[PDB]
Amino acid sequence: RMRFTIDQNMQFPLVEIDLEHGGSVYLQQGSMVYHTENVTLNTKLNGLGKLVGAIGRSMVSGESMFITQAMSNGDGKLALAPNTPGQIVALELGEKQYRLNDGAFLALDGSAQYKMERQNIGGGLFVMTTEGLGTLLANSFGSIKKITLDGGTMTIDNAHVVAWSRELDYDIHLENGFMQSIGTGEGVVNTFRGHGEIYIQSLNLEQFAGTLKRYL
Template sequence: GAIGRSLTSGESMFITQATGDADGGQIGVAPAIPGEIVKLSVGKQQYCLNTGAFLASDDSVSYKMRSQKLSKAAFGGTGGFFVMETEGEGDMLVNAFGDLVELTVTSDKPISIDNEHVIAWDSSLDYDIQVASGMFGFTSGEGLVNHFTGDGKVLIQTRNLHSLAEALQPFIVEKNSNS
């Protein structure tokens, strides 16, 4: 299962399991990139997660790989043919690059969000990945947006890792192999 999740989601094949041996014990976790960490209560509400959003969870919470439509997979760029969907009941931690902002989608107010900024969304929402029309939303080099409809919440990150990498590129000195 771990190999399948790794191949389909890009997540690590290895998941560390930690168990407290004494009352009052604490475990520290941190993502690879700087940003906010948010606790999601999984159970009555289940979530879909973009690649890289999962940080940690209770052992009663897990995620499965759900196949996407071919059009979503072709445009998605992150999850490919699969998206992670939570299962179980308990707490899950997700992380983002920058701050996390919660947006509300209603049946009369759908929303389009730059694909690079989407972290997690209520699994009850319907979504489609489309080429951006230049209207509301963040901009990215790909020009792809996730269009959400229905009633629920979407978590977005305020920063874009690909944009940071592009901004840093002129300052990265490449070694000359002839030196």
């Protein structure tokens, strides 16, 4: 297993990861800040032509083109940074597994596995589901709040959903017509049912991007 250290004093954390010989970790594309010489970064693109094959094989394998993997030859170190201002949460995988929205993934033990699934509509919207043993690092835009469902139901703007228990029943959908959505400024929501945890974030990336539009 990889050993990590999420900075506790920094408002916007960096995560330092220690990898033993032969150890590896999946990471958010571009999240690398630095790494020791004995640590190599591998991608699926190892001009045009069969890079289409690279993308082609991932679409059926359920893999993501925006996830890379770092391998260590001996004891190595690396540091990652989330692509959005916020926090990082580490979740232990095993008896419990999780699903995550696009952009919430930061890192995953090489010992674990993951699969991507396109949601059946209200680009594309994909949800990641974990499997195996290891640690999952999720990141938020804004601050994180942990909510526990004890059998009931709850519906939340999906733009504020970071990750949630795989054991929960979920459904991402639109609450009304497109024209009605234009007025509310609300996108698809995620309705959860059952027992498990839901991690939400206090900021909406789409809404923030919207405030920048006028100046762009």
